Ligand SMILES: c1cnc2[nH]ccc2c1
Ligand SMILES: c1cnc2[nH]ccc2c1
């Protein structure tokens with residue numbers, strides 16, 4: 001584990017992360033997809049062999065010795081707010097299990113269900129709080145990757161508030 005486990009946020013492509021493993025914002029079918037998923041497909045295409053897995057689960061596939069944890073958040077265009085919220089919490093708990101099993105000291109993670117799966121709503125706080133609930137009991141250094149400068153400021157503030 002990390003010497004002093006931390007949360008950090010960076011505004012850059014998760015495909016260029018400096019961590020020992022990556023979480024993909026996957027689709028259930030292991031398809032190349034869009035956004036984070038397409039960047040992951042371009043960087044680690046070997047990791048999409050038998051990566052298909054249901055909503056609310058995570059499945060790890062190695063690209064060489066580099067682990068890609070395919071985490072399937074709910075599409076809020078299909079789920080109720082209540083059922084979506086349950087599956088989103090579950091996907092992050094499955095990520096925590098995988099990160100623990102792999103024995104990594106660090107992990108790069110996007111905010112699940114906040115892009116094209118958001119059902120047109122701002123889910124920064126919802127997704128981030130489920131991330132914390134899952135990862136708080138792990139000792140890996142967590143680095144959150146986002147696109148938007150306003151999201152970087154809000155994620156940074158939320159991390160600092162707990163410190
Ligand atoms: C691709 C993905 N995420 C990004 N954040 C800042 C620039 C950039 C490009
Ligand atoms: C957030 C972080 N990294 C990304 N790569 C491609 C899109 C995206 C969004």
Ligand SMILES: [Cl-]
Pocket residue numbers: 011012013016
């Ligand atoms: Cl970048």
Ligand SMILES: [Cl-]
Pocket residue numbers: 025112113114115116117118
């Ligand atoms: Cl998404």
Ligand SMILES: [Cl-]
Pocket residue numbers: 111114145146147148151
């Ligand atoms: Cl983002």
